[PDB]
Design a protein around this ligand. Sequence first.
Ligand SMILES: OC[C@H]1O[C@](O)(CO)[C@@H](O)[C@@H]1O
Ligand SMILES: OC[C@H]1O[C@](O)(CO)[C@@H](O)[C@@H]1O
Ligand SMILES: OC[C@H]1O[C@](O)(CO)[C@@H](O)[C@@H]1O
Ligand SMILES: OC[C@H]1O[C@](O)(CO)[C@@H](O)[C@@H]1O
Length: 494
Amino acid sequence: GLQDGPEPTIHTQQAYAPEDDFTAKWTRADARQLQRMSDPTAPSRENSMPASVTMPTVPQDFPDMSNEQVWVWDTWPLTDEDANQYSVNGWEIIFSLVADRNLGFDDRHVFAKIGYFYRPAGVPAAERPENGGWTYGGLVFKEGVTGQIFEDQSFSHQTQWSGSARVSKNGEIKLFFTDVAFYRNSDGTNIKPYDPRIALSVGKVKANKKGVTLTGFNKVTDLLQADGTYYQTGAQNEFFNFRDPFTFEDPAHPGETFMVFEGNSAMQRETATCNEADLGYRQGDPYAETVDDVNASGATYQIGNVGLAKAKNKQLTEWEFLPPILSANCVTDQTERPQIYFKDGKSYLFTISHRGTFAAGLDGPEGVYGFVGDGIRSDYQPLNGGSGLALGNPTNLNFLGGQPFAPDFNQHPGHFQAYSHYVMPGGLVQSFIDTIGTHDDFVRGGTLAPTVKMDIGVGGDPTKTAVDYSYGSEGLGGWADIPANKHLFTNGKF
Ligand SMILES: OC[C@H]1O[C@](O)(CO)[C@@H](O)[C@@H]1O
Ligand SMILES: OC[C@H]1O[C@](O)(CO)[C@@H](O)[C@@H]1O
Ligand SMILES: OC[C@H]1O[C@](O)(CO)[C@@H](O)[C@@H]1O
Ligand SMILES: OC[C@H]1O[C@](O)(CO)[C@@H](O)[C@@H]1O
């Protein structure tokens, strides 16, 4: 099922110490496996990617989870150190990026705020309302709280971007998020590079038959900002990426807490260079590229990475940067919302990427990219023939991808059907709808897609994944289905 092309880079999956300076590479040889898996003959508007690594097609006639109260995108459940998802006092609880529904959908990122939703626990997806049955609890933060941490109070915009939320046995919520200040002119041009920081706010859940409210979240702790040695700063790159904290405990490292997040490789933007390891070709491969050609191609502007940090105290208020665990130099600018998923003694690193963010020479669908190894720092093996693709939107890779605000004439109408995928226990994947439809008949989402099922480690092979098309209806589960697998009871009432 593979078009002729380069062999994938040999990865060993060998574990290293979390403190080691080893950084796994998702190589150009690896990423070129995506084109090899693509069917070059796929007709207009048909998916060219294998069905087993393609998200089931989402109906253009979709429900809205908030009844159009707000735009909703990146969503996370309430988790413990093993990423189990929780209900509290009979309520499933989630956090989402939200914005005023009056905004143009594409203008919402600089008005982003974290809200929460709740719904009764223990109702099967088929018994719930079509739209998932969530209640919008409103915003997590009072106005002016998240601005606390910024010395420069001259920002034109101040937002809360994605993260994660930990719940203790005693009902305490530690919300890890991206706290962002923007310094923009009225047309959007920067006055100085934006300021995204990894941050923490602590609060409490109050829940009974009336619903869920939150208390606390009045103080914000500034945990991490880009350093310039491991993770690219604003001075190195005006549009550097630094966001999306996911915390966890590594079974291999008892009694410590780690965090993954999105960054870029710490290189000056306009003088960034790639090397032989970034290309990752086997000696003599007839399809190998030269370092000079790649460096001349423009691919050097795509230098995303996945970072690691280790907590310095039990309160998780102090963190230490560790070297990056994955770099995609000359492959992609954006490895977003990383998470570490633990299965059968392996460490799965899952991350999301756009189609447009791939480097020159490369191409792949919007969706979930994944990597397996024997430790949180390992010589990670990109999933599915070394390509990295776990779960892509249906995509004809033979035609231009277009944009979510202007779909391409020849593209599959589900090209942008989902983003910010998150892999839940049992391989259930939740995501939000960006765009569904053809070039002249499309709609914007800003609500969650149907939850789907990805089987991880198909056959006896931990490097392989496959969509389960028998799940729900033809592969599509409940709209906005973010089910709890653990249940907590606490003092919090209101
Ligand atoms: O968790 C602390 C332990 O982990 C290490 O730092 C290695 O990753 C060891 O040197 C130490 O015993
Ligand atoms: O809106 C910004 C947020 O959206 C994403 O780009 C994905 O949709 C995240 O990486 C980020 O936290
Ligand atoms: O604890 C069980 C009770 O909690 C709820 O899920 C929410 O209040 C109710 O639907 C149920 O009667
Ligand atoms: O809501 C309409 C349809 O959407 C699904 O969740 C999957 O697309 C089905 O279960 C339902 O029939």
